[PDB]
Write an enzyme that holds these catalytic residues in place. Structure first.
Site, mmCIF file in Angstrom:
data_model
loop_
_atom_site.group_PDB
_atom_site.id
_atom_site.type_symbol
_atom_site.label_atom_id
_atom_site.label_comp_id
_atom_site.label_asym_id
_atom_site.label_seq_id
_atom_site.Cartn_x
_atom_site.Cartn_y
_atom_site.Cartn_z
ATOM 1 N N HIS A 72 17.201 1.582 14.539
ATOM 2 C CA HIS A 72 18.165 0.646 13.971
ATOM 3 C C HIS A 72 19.422 1.400 13.560
ATOM 4 O O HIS A 72 19.351 2.461 12.930
ATOM 5 C CB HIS A 72 17.577 -0.093 12.766
ATOM 6 C CG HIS A 72 16.505 -1.074 13.127
ATOM 7 N ND1 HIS A 72 16.225 -2.185 12.361
ATOM 8 C CD2 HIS A 72 15.642 -1.108 14.170
ATOM 9 C CE1 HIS A 72 15.237 -2.862 12.918
ATOM 10 N NE2 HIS A 72 14.865 -2.229 14.016
ATOM 11 N N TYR A 201 18.494 -7.567 3.700
ATOM 12 C CA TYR A 201 18.148 -7.465 2.287
ATOM 13 C C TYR A 201 18.918 -8.589 1.623
ATOM 14 O O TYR A 201 20.130 -8.689 1.783
ATOM 15 C CB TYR A 201 18.610 -6.131 1.716
ATOM 16 C CG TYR A 201 17.759 -4.952 2.126
ATOM 17 C CD1 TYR A 201 16.748 -4.472 1.291
ATOM 18 C CD2 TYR A 201 17.977 -4.301 3.337
ATOM 19 C CE1 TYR A 201 15.978 -3.371 1.652
ATOM 20 C CE2 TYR A 201 17.212 -3.199 3.706
ATOM 21 C CZ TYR A 201 16.219 -2.741 2.858
ATOM 22 O OH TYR A 201 15.484 -1.639 3.217
ATOM 23 N N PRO A 293 9.918 0.150 -3.208
ATOM 24 C CA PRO A 293 10.139 0.041 -1.759
ATOM 25 C C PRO A 293 11.555 -0.296 -1.310
ATOM 26 O O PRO A 293 11.905 -0.084 -0.148
ATOM 27 C CB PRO A 293 9.147 -1.043 -1.336
ATOM 28 C CG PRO A 293 8.082 -0.963 -2.371
ATOM 29 C CD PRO A 293 8.873 -0.790 -3.639
ATOM 30 N N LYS A 297 12.023 4.823 0.752
ATOM 31 C CA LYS A 297 11.984 6.269 0.567
ATOM 32 C C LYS A 297 10.604 6.881 0.341
ATOM 33 O O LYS A 297 10.417 8.075 0.566
ATOM 34 C CB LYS A 297 12.913 6.652 -0.591
ATOM 35 C CG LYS A 297 14.381 6.391 -0.282
ATOM 36 C CD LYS A 297 14.920 7.433 0.690
ATOM 37 C CE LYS A 297 16.226 7.005 1.335
ATOM 38 N NZ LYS A 297 16.012 6.346 2.656
ATOM 39 N N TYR A 385 20.738 5.782 2.717
ATOM 40 C CA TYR A 385 19.720 5.008 3.420
ATOM 41 C C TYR A 385 19.095 5.813 4.565
ATOM 42 O O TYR A 385 17.875 5.838 4.721
ATOM 43 C CB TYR A 385 20.314 3.711 3.970
ATOM 44 C CG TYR A 385 19.259 2.691 4.316
ATOM 45 C CD1 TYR A 385 18.712 1.866 3.331
ATOM 46 C CD2 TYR A 385 18.753 2.592 5.614
ATOM 47 C CE1 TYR A 385 17.688 0.974 3.626
ATOM 48 C CE2 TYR A 385 17.723 1.698 5.920
ATOM 49 C CZ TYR A 385 17.199 0.893 4.921
ATOM 50 O OH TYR A 385 16.202 -0.012 5.219
HETATM 51 C C1 LIG Z 1 5.462 -2.980 0.106
HETATM 52 C C2 LIG Z 1 5.418 -1.461 0.495
HETATM 53 C C3 LIG Z 1 6.471 -1.059 1.289
HETATM 54 C C4 LIG Z 1 6.876 0.279 1.568
HETATM 55 N N1 LIG Z 1 7.895 0.480 2.480
HETATM 56 C C5 LIG Z 1 8.234 1.818 2.748
HETATM 57 C C6 LIG Z 1 9.256 2.045 3.765
HETATM 58 O O1 LIG Z 1 9.722 1.224 4.575
HETATM 59 N N2 LIG Z 1 9.646 3.389 3.902
HETATM 60 C C7 LIG Z 1 9.145 4.459 3.188
HETATM 61 O O2 LIG Z 1 9.628 5.578 3.319
HETATM 62 N N3 LIG Z 1 8.162 4.205 2.281
HETATM 63 C C8 LIG Z 1 7.728 2.941 2.077
HETATM 64 N N4 LIG Z 1 6.594 2.655 1.156
HETATM 65 C C9 LIG Z 1 5.910 3.750 0.435
HETATM 66 C C10 LIG Z 1 4.814 4.545 1.233
HETATM 67 O O3 LIG Z 1 3.948 3.664 1.965
HETATM 68 C C11 LIG Z 1 4.053 5.560 0.379
HETATM 69 O O4 LIG Z 1 5.024 6.408 -0.252
HETATM 70 C C12 LIG Z 1 3.016 6.385 1.229
HETATM 71 O O5 LIG Z 1 1.819 5.602 1.467
HETATM 72 C C13 LIG Z 1 2.596 7.700 0.567
HETATM 73 O O6 LIG Z 1 1.782 8.464 1.403
HETATM 74 P P1 LIG Z 1 0.714 9.507 0.834
HETATM 75 O O7 LIG Z 1 1.434 10.416 -0.085
HETATM 76 O O8 LIG Z 1 -0.030 10.056 1.974
HETATM 77 O O9 LIG Z 1 -0.234 8.595 -0.034
HETATM 78 P P2 LIG Z 1 -1.286 7.412 0.366
HETATM 79 O O10 LIG Z 1 -1.660 6.734 -0.905
HETATM 80 O O11 LIG Z 1 -0.829 6.600 1.521
HETATM 81 O O12 LIG Z 1 -2.540 8.275 0.846
HETATM 82 C C14 LIG Z 1 -3.357 9.052 -0.051
HETATM 83 C C15 LIG Z 1 -4.847 9.153 0.394
HETATM 84 O O13 LIG Z 1 -5.591 9.796 -0.663
HETATM 85 C C16 LIG Z 1 -6.852 9.163 -0.776
HETATM 86 N N5 LIG Z 1 -7.510 9.461 -2.077
HETATM 87 C C17 LIG Z 1 -7.200 9.002 -3.334
HETATM 88 N N6 LIG Z 1 -7.883 9.553 -4.288
HETATM 89 C C18 LIG Z 1 -8.705 10.442 -3.632
HETATM 90 C C19 LIG Z 1 -9.649 11.335 -4.113
HETATM 91 N N7 LIG Z 1 -9.824 11.518 -5.418
HETATM 92 N N8 LIG Z 1 -10.297 12.078 -3.207
HETATM 93 C C20 LIG Z 1 -10.010 11.934 -1.926
HETATM 94 N N9 LIG Z 1 -9.138 11.133 -1.355
HETATM 95 C C21 LIG Z 1 -8.501 10.398 -2.285
HETATM 96 C C22 LIG Z 1 -6.532 7.710 -0.530
HETATM 97 O O14 LIG Z 1 -7.701 6.959 -0.222
HETATM 98 C C23 LIG Z 1 -5.496 7.772 0.571
HETATM 99 O O15 LIG Z 1 -6.066 7.597 1.878
HETATM 100 C C24 LIG Z 1 6.119 1.299 0.949
HETATM 101 C C25 LIG Z 1 5.021 0.899 0.158
HETATM 102 C C26 LIG Z 1 4.582 -0.403 -0.118
HETATM 103 N N10 LIG Z 1 3.361 -0.481 -0.782
HETATM 104 C C27 LIG Z 1 2.370 -1.538 -0.665
HETATM 105 C C28 LIG Z 1 2.846 0.573 -1.669
#
Ligand SMILES: Cc1cc2nc3c(=O)[nH]c(=O)nc-3n(C[C@H](O)[C@H](O)[C@H](O)COP(=O)(O)OP(=O)(O)OC[C@H]3O[C@@H](n4cnc5c(N)ncnc54)[C@H](O)[C@@H]3O)c2cc1N(C)C
Length: 394
Positions: A72, A201, A293, A297, A385
């Site tokens: 994009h 947005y 979100p 980031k 962004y």
């Molecule tokens: C609405 C939404 C939109 C988002 N949109 C974007 C976007 O467009 N661009 C972007 O850059 N980020 C967005 N986010 C945020 C993003 O998804 C998060 O920052 C991202 O998931 C982070 O990644 P990670 O640091 O890898 O973290 P995760 O939470 O994805 O993965 C961590 C893993 O650790 C496990 N775990 C937990 N405790 C444990 C334990 N004690 N022992 C062993 N394993 C354990 C979990 O089961 C899991 O599998 C979003 C997050 C949202 N939600 C629902 C949180």
């Protein structure tokens, strides 16, 4: 068991670091509490910075993204009956972002890791960290009953907000910076073509709304909702009706609706801990910080933390320069805070906050008018962004 780098969490952070380290000849074992399918149930991210895209290509896991992902060059912001396009490519000096679901990325990484034969232990219960201050730290856990021990040189805490890694550091050694917003995002993934080729947005009197996507036939929409709202009170019908009401009529009219593949409510929060390490323990991604979100980031900061940690670990193993790992937190925090500030600003100017007096309302409206109506203003938005450049290190 024995490895060089123990990784807690098989989410995007752990998988990417593990993949990167594997390709560089650095042994690593990932310990995941959940099952593979459970991890794959999370939709989350949709927008990836070029830095994340490159890191994926460096991980050798970019075939699918290259084929299915969409680049994009701009995004739109709707407010006060206006629609302002932010030409990201032009304003940022040629930089862009890519739309490719976090689910797919995670999936691409998982399959790639399995194929390479790297070690990953799912359903690893009771993960506990030990001897972080020594040169021989280790992790203990339980798999199908018995307690196992994993020796290593370094532990990478990639276990998310509620992971055990951040709770394994003496609280008094850390400083927490946090803010919880008075609202959450109700998201809806539908198997329908997006209403626009670029994200929209929308700041509306009724509340925030966002039109995003995953592909030409898959859409992801969000609407702001107060904390009291439960997902079970929002039928697909109620969602579509409210979404439409918060979008320009010319957009709502042609919006193709359909049954949800997934609906859920995600609360908004900003969170940062300092430092991000302790002895042989390094925190990465959500384990160290959270962003609303609004700025897309979260996953992208996980990417930059991982890139930084990986390159420092290379210096350590390949060049015997382990003292450089001491700069991890400082380096990462600089990019983190700038990303936190942007995410906070985006959140601040696009959402409706309860108990907003007349002045605050006018200022929010003027912030959009100014930033969206000034070349310099538009530039601060675009460059942020697409994401600020990674710090070279060394
Ligand atoms: C609405 C939404 C939109 C988002 N949109 C974007 C976007 O467009 N661009 C972007 O850059 N980020 C967005 N986010 C945020 C993003 O998804 C998060 O920052 C991202 O998931 C982070 O990644 P990670 O640091 O890898 O973290 P995760 O939470 O994805 O993965 C961590 C893993 O650790 C496990 N775990 C937990 N405790 C444990 C334990 N004690 N022992 C062993 N394993 C354990 C979990 O089961 C899991 O599998 C979003 C997050 C949202 N939600 C629902 C949180």
């Amino acid at each position: 068991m024995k490895t060089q780098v123990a990784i807690i969490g098989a989410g995007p952070s752990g998988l990417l670091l593990g993949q990167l380290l594997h390709k560089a000849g650095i042994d690593n074992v990932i310990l995941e509490r959940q099952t593979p399918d459970y991890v794959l149930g999370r939709i989350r991210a949709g927008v990836l910075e070029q830095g994340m895209v490159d890191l994926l290509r460096e991980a050798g896991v970019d075939r699918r993204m290259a084929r299915d992902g969409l680049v994009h060059e701009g995004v739109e912001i709707a407010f006060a009956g206006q629609r302002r396009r932010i030409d990201l490519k032009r304003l940022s000096g040629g930089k862009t972002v890519t739309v490719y679901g976090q689910t797919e990325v995670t999936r691409d990484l998982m399959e790639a890791r399995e194929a390479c034969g790297a070690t990953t232990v799912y359903q690893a219960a009771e993960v506990r960290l030990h001897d972080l201050q020594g040169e021989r730290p280790y992790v203990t856990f339980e798999r199908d009953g018995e307690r196992l021990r994993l020796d290593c040189d370094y532990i990478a805490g990639c276990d998310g907000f509620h992971g055990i890694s951040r709770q394994s550091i003496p609280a008094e050694r850390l400083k927490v910076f946090e803010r919880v917003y008075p609202f959450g995002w109700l998201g809806l993934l539908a198997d329908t073509p997006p209403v626009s080729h670029e994200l929209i947005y929308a700041n509306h009197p009724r509340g925030f709304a966002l039109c995003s996507q995953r592909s030409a036939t898959r859409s992801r929409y969000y609407v702001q909702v107060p904390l009291s709202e439960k997902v079970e009170d929002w039928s697909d019908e109620r969602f579509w009706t409210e979404l439409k009401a918060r979008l320009p009529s010319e957009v709502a009219e042609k919006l193709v609706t359909g049954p949800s593949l997934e609906k859920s409510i995600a609360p908004l929060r900003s969170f940062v801990v300092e430092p991000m390490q302790h002895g042989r323990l390094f925190l990465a991604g959500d384990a160290a910080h959270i962003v609303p979100p609004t700025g897309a980031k979260g996953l992208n900061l996980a990417a930059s933390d991982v890139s930084t940690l990986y390159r420092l670990l290379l210096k350590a193993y390949r060049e015997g320069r382990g003292e450089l790992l001491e700069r991890y937190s400082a380096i990462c925090l600089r990019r983190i805070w700038k990303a936190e500030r942007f995410s906070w600003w985006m959140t601040s100017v696009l959402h409706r906050f309860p108990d907003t007096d007349a002045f605050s309302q006018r200022i929010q409206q003027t912030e959009l008018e100014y930033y969206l109506g000034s070349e310099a203003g538009l530039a601060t938005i675009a460059e942020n962004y697409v994401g600020l450049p990674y710090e070279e290190i060394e």
